[PDB]
């Protein structure tokens, strides 16, 4: 229905985003310039204050001090407080009105998972930009992998939850810097593995998790559960 118009939209968004980067780069230059000015100011004040303090009333010094405290520090304060981001933030705010939202992001994640399921694609192939045509181009981060795994999880696809969580963990092992909570990754991964019936592996992953978070309530309970049954 509105399908073909939506293609038109994504193309427009790609060009909009390029304009946002231009704006962002302008903001950066403005902040760099402001910071260079403050650094030179701080350097001057550093020299003045250091000299004045390592000294264990003269009207020249008194005038210079009164004026610096009363006047010069207020001008410095005004510069520190000066916002350089208005232009960038104004444009971003206007442009966001046309951005995809959380539902769109989830929709796209599901469409990727659907493609994977249809062509039986392996995760590393998807993640490392090894799908045909677009060769070695778009890469998924460890966090992207975790997110896809969690979408699979909400749909009760524990098989793909397992594959995506393991990909996230492999990328970390390979040295990817990331902010994902590896405990949480293991939390979902151990449950997905448990659901498919591999108790041995679920037990293993539970022990891995407890190394990282000894107080993890759910994992501690899972270990007692496994130790009860498996033993």
């Amino acid at each position: 229905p509105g399908f073909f118009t939506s293609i038109g939209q994504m193309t427009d968004l790609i060009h909009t985003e390029k304009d946002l980067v231009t704006s962002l780069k302008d903001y950066i230059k403005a902040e760099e310039d402001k910071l260079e000015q403050i650094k030179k100011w701080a350097e001057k004040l550093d020299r003045l204050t250091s000299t004045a303090t390592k000294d264990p009333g003269h009207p020249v010094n008194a005038f210079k001090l009164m004026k610096r405290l009363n006047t010069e520090w207020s001008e410095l304060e005004n510069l520190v407080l000066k916002d350089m981001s208005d232009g960038f933030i104004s444009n971003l705010t206007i442009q966001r009105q046309y951005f995809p939202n959380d539902e769109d992001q989830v929709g796209a994640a599901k469409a990727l998972l659907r493609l994977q399921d249809t062509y039986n694609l392996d995760t590393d192939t998807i993640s490392k930009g090894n799908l045909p045509g677009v060769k070695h181009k778009s890469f998924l981060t460890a966090e992207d992998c975790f997110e896809l795994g969690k979408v699979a999880y909400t749909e009760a696809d524990y098989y793909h939850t397992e594959l995506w969580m393991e990909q996230a963990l492999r990328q970390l092992d390979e040295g990817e810097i990331s902010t994902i909570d590896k405990v949480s990754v293991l939390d979902y991964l151990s449950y997905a593995v448990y659901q498919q019936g591999d108790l041995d592996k679920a037990l293993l992953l539970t022990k891995k998790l407890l190394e990282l978070d000894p107080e993890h309530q759910r994992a501690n309970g899972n270990l007692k559960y496994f130790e009860y049954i498996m033993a």
Binding site: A202, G221, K224, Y225, Y228
Partner: peptide
């Protein structure tokens, strides 16, 4: 008895 089985996170 043991704890309840692993719950979904």
């Amino acid at each position: 008895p043991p704890p309840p089985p692993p719950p979904p996170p």
